[PDB]
Design a protein around this ligand. Structure first.
Ligand SMILES: [Ca+2]
Ligand SMILES: [Cl-]
Length: 159
């Protein structure tokens, strides 16, 4: 019986991006799909990307494209106080109130983003990194996604 907001479901698919010779940029692309039977508002969706910042105290998020406008995508980067395997930092991606809604079976398509540091990142020790998904989008369950702050996709980096 549950009601609409308990049967709402999303999934995220992921593509690892390129790395060059400066190595101070994390690149990745996500796609958010509505896999349930009711419409979801993008403003109720958050996505987290978990990583180790490798000494960088400044980690800046930028969204480079979204079908509905980059100006509708927000990101913040927060430190994690305690120690968890593969993450001392997370990047939390959210959407503004006018980003729109996803119908059932709808998806955002590609949302590429960068996290930029002053110093080099080693991505092999980042929880959310999966280099096997370089050629194609894959089911990276080490990125998590929330609807109204409830976990709906993935497995959280766990103390
Ligand atoms: Ca790292
Ligand atoms: Cl807003």
């Amino acid at each position: 019986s549950q009601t609409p907001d308990a049967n709402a479901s999303i999934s995220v698919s992921y593509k690892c991006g390129v790395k060059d010779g400066t190595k101070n940029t994390i690149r990745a692309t996500i796609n958010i799909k509505n896999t349930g039977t009711t419409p979801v508002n993008l403003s109720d969706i958050k996505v987290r990307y978990w990583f180790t910042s490798d000494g960088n105290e400044q980690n800046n998020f930028v969204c480079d494209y979204a079908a509905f406008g980059t100006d509708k995508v927000k990101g913040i980067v927060k430190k994690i106080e305690n120690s968890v395997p593969g993450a001392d930092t997370y990047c939390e991606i959210s959407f503004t109130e006018d980003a729109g809604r996803l119908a059932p079976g709808g998806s955002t398509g590609t949302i590429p983003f960068r996290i930029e540091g002053a110093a080099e990142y080693d991505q092999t020790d980042d929880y959310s990194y999966n280099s096997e998904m370089s050629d194609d989008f894959g089911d990276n369950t080490k990125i998590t996604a929330y609807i109204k702050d409830k976990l709906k996709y993935g497995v959280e980096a766990a103390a």
